[PDB]
Design a protein around this nucleic acid. Structure first.
Ligand SMILES: Cc1cn([C@H]2C[C@H](O)[C@@H](COP(=O)(O)NP(=O)(O)OP(=O)(O)O)O2)c(=O)[nH]c1=O
Ligand SMILES: [Mg+2]
Ligand SMILES: [Mg+2]
Ligand code: NA
Ligand code: NA
Length: 324
DNA sequence: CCGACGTCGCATCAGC
DNA sequence: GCTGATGCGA
DNA sequence: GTCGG
């Protein structure tokens, strides 16, 4: 459970400062990877040396663990926690649309809190204003029961627009999780293929707006929608606003997309690793046979999830068991 | 020693 | 005004 | 920061 919580909390804090303040994205992923492998380690760690055996834990982190075990803290982490500039930069990045660079410029000109952002609207782009407005809501998870109600609305409205649409809610929801961070909707239509309107996505977004399910828009192109939605108010407390993505994908790429965006991260590259072990390369869009040469062949037809499993020596697995 | 470390759509900026 | 670069999220 | 060619 929280067997090494102090250690993994420490490493996660370190990770965020690397990304958000130091702008060192690879150190960010290094720390997270370290925190991940430790989180799954089934023993209360006794030394940095014990930890270093794990893939992703090196000399520096082994050292930091030693300091944490001896003193209950890290001098460097304590110090940066207390730094007004650095802690403010790291905090502002919690607002969707504010990345490390925007957070930096804000703190440079004295803008450090949500309140400061509130009285400085004209310095905010469209995404950032939405991120600010739903700061709290965007940090809540979504009970699976609300996700089902959300799914009810999306499948109904999609079919209403055109009964030949195919939509699938992917991500942690499809894997059967008890809660979700967002709603990932994948969309296709038999008239849409790789060698094939901009309206296929627009019409679906517009209908979800008409019935007031979709409430705001972060981005909307011809293939990808990123926005905000909310279940109707049950004389009751209103539901939090939620993040929803809608992806339009060609029919011949749809099920690679569904497999991909169902995950999990770790599960899927085990699956990709195993796939190439046999001369097939899997990506988001396609699956493709390698030659003796290493040259990829032309992409192969896929018409179900299970299809890809059959191309590559694997019995189809339920979404329910796809953590790894 | 020292380069890789994931990738890509969309919004918006920077250069011309 | 057009094209490529950058910031961002996931 | 860690790994590995
Ligand atoms: C965006 C993205 C997603 N994925 C897979 C893994 C995730 O399980 C799945 C959906 O992405 P997610 O919404 O970022 N994470 P999640 O849906 O699994 O969990 P959550 O409840 O949204 O937090 O897509 C990748 O493997 N590479 C990616 O770049
Ligand atoms: Mg998700
Ligand atoms: Mg997502
Ligand atoms: Na090691
Ligand atoms: Na942010």
């Amino acid at each position: 459970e929280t067997l090494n919580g102090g250690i993994t909390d420490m490493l996660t804090e370190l990770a965020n400062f690397e990304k958000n303040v130091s702008q060192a994205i690879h150190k960010y992923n290094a720390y997270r990877k370290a925190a991940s492998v430790i989180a799954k380690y089934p023993h209360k760690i006794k030394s940095g040396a014990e930890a270093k055996k794990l893939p992703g834990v090196g000399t520096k982190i082994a050292e930091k663990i030693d300091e944490f075990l001896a003193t209950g803290k890290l001098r460097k982490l304590e110090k940066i926690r207390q730094d007004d500039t650095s802690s403010s930069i790291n905090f502002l990045t919690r607002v969707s649309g504010i990345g490390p660079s925007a957070a930096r410029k804000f703190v440079d000109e004295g803008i450090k809190t949500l309140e400061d952002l509130r009285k400085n609207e004209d310095k905010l782009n469209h995404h950032q204003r939405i991120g600010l407005k739903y700061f709290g809501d965007f940090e809540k998870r979504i009970p699976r029961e609300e996700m089902l109600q959300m799914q009810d609305i999306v499948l109904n409205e999609v079919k209403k627009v055109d009964s030949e649409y195919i939509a699938t809610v992917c991500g942690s929801f499809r894997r059967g999780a008890e809660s979700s961070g967002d709603m990932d909707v994948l969309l296709t239509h038999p008239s849409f293929t790789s060698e094939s309107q901009p309206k296929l996505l627009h019409q679906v977004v517009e209908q979800l707006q008409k019935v007031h399910f979709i409430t705001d828009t972060l981005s909307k192109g011809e293939t990808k929608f990123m926005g905000v939605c909310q279940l109707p108010s049950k004389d009751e407390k209103e539901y939090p606003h939620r993040r929803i993505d809608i992806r339009l994908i060609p029919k011949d790429q749809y099920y690679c997309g569904v497999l991909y965006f169902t995950g999990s991260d770790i599960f899927n590259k085990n699956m990709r690793a195993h796939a190439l072990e046999k001369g097939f390369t899997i990506n988001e869009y396609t699956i493709r046979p390698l030659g003796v040469t290493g040259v990829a062949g032309e992409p192969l037809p896929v018409d179900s999830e299970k299809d890809i499993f059959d191309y590559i020596q694997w019995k189809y697995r339920e979404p329910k068991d796809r953590s790894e």
